[PDB]
Amino acid sequence: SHMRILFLSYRFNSLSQRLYCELTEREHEVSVELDVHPDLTVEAAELYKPDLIIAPFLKRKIPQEVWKKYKTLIIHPGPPGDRGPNALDWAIMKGERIWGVTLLEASEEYDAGDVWAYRTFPMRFARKASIYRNEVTEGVVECVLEALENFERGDFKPTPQKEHWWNPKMEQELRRVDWEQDDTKTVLRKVYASDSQPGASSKVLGKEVLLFNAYPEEELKGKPGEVLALRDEAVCIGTRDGAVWITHMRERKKESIKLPSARVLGEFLKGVKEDPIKPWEKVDFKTYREILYEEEDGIGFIHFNFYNGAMSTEQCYRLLETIKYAKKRPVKAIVLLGSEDFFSNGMNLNTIENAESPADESWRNINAIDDVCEEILKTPDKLTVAGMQGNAGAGGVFLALTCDLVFAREGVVLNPHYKNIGNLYGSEFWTYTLPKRVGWEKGKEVMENRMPISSKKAFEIGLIDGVFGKTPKEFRQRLKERIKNFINSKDFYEFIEKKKKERTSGEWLEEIQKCREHELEKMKLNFYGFDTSYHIARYYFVRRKPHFRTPPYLAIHRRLKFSL
Ligand SMILES: CC(C)(COP(=O)(O)OP(=O)(O)OC[C@H]1O[C@@H](n2cnc3c(N)ncnc32)[C@H](O)[C@@H]1OP(=O)(O)O)[C@@H](O)C(=O)NCCC(=O)NCCS
């Protein structure tokens, strides 16, 4: 059973990439056609002639010519019977306690097809994107694997829908936050239902904005709509009964991009006071903590909740400050945990795109990331560990590899390459860490592969040291147990005595300095050289520019030597 499977995806998004890894690592072939136009979708099917079509992320209706000829299954992010384009938005706005995902056949009527598989799950009070990347994605994987087994068996019949309901596209009027009428729980519900797109509209300091990444505040109080404080570029705003933090906003304009709230509001905030809390402080009320440092059982854990895993220059230096603090503490190990949804996606391309000089801001940002990496590497007397609870891409992968040990949750998707951002050389000391893990020949192959790999595949090729756990919480518990056991063994003390000798030696310090110098000379060429492919790629990415064809790295059926 080696199936030829065509994906129909609006973008090759997180769910599409996860399914690509699950199917190809089971020796199926997956070609992708991006959802650009029905004419191109029909052509892709006739070119590739798939055994099965899966649509992980659909914007347009699939043409009848296609799904009447090829068995075509659609992912719907609601339980059986739920129909409509905004299933998760409604489940969050209505406060559903149970939700689910359905794999159904394409049909003439919208979302009316017979059910191949479904999964249900309890809802969290959390952003839509977090539900999509965790509960929905895990359930969809189980559905698709079940359906492939059923498809190959050959006598399967799907289950017609019985009860069903329709929810239309959700209008912004429903999402709009009114500070005087809305209590904190209502503001959170609206922002969660609209994050990461399209955003919940509001007015803040007279500016029409879209709100993203909200957190409740229990200490600061004021008038509704009043800005109460700034913290790490997030703003705290009074609600009907309390206050909420908004970390990111977008102006309500076609060309504007998502940015830290302080950068969107700008001079309108003049006079607001910063209300800082250090990551290592303890507080007994709910508040916004971008970076959190906690110690348990001789292990110092650093959580860094950078929105979308994107690490701005200033976020990197706040992470650096926390790592330096941890290195002065009486812990045996330091664990970098990222956030539940992302370990890291490297430099923050949005704050780079927004800068007066994107090239200069890129230079600032890569030097700040390398300072984090260098601080991690130069830790002679403590174990360092990267715990990847969620996805990582580009420099975010190589940030993890600077740690002594890298572990990841099952189902994490890695993109250890720069092919989507103009072929940057990369830094983060990859020219030291990567050959140490996989060898030079394999390391070059890894960085030449533009397709994603799972954490299981990363473990199998030696890129990371272990993979375990199904949820972020299970992964964190198992990681803590594994590290606790290690640091309480004689093996740890022998390892640290070796590490102390290696990492204070002149030869090693010269080696990693030469690695940083060489990588940054190449990145300087990427950022400032006459060839501006990096800047063009960043613009297309950050501005979400549309596609007019599917590139052959995705579309096997559009490659030069393709036939049959
Ligand atoms: C890693 C990657 C392939 C994952 O693809 P994916 O699973 O489909 O996830 P998405 O592209 O949808 O990312 C989710 C969100 O994070 C944003 N994002 C991801 N990486 C980002 C980055 N480095 N900077 C700014 N935003 C980033 C995306 O724009 C998207 O934003 P939105 O939901 O608010 O609209 C893709 O996000 C990517 O190429 N990121 C850039 C990594 C990079 O090039 N960094 C700079 C060089 S170090």
Numbering used by the authors: -1 to 562
Paper text:
HypX will catalyze two consecutive reactions, the formyl-group transfer from N10-formyl-THF to CoA and decarbonylation of formyl-CoA, in the N- and C-terminal domains, respectively, to produce CO. The putative catalytic residues, His74, Asp80, and Asp109 in the N-terminal domain and Ty416 and Glu426 in the C-terminal domain, are perfectly conserved among HypX homologs listed in the previous report. CoA is constitutively bound in HypX, which will act as the prosthetic group for CO biosynthesis through the formation and the decarbonylation of formyl-CoA.
We obtained diffraction-quality crystals of HypX with two different space groups (C2221 and P41212 for Forms I and II, respectively) under crystallization conditions as described in Methods. Their crystal structures were determined at a resolution of 1.80 and 2.40 Å for Forms I and II, respectively. Based on the results of MS analyses and the shape of the electron density, we assumed the molecule bound in the cavity to be CoA, whose molecular weight is 767, and found that it was the case. The occupancy and B-factor of CoA were 1.0 and 27.0 Å2, respectively. As we did not add CoA during the purification and crystallization of HypX, it was thought to be bound to HypX in E. coli cells. There are Tyr416 and Glu426 near the SH group of CoA adopting the folded conformation, which are candidates for a general base responsible for decarbonylation of formyl-CoA.
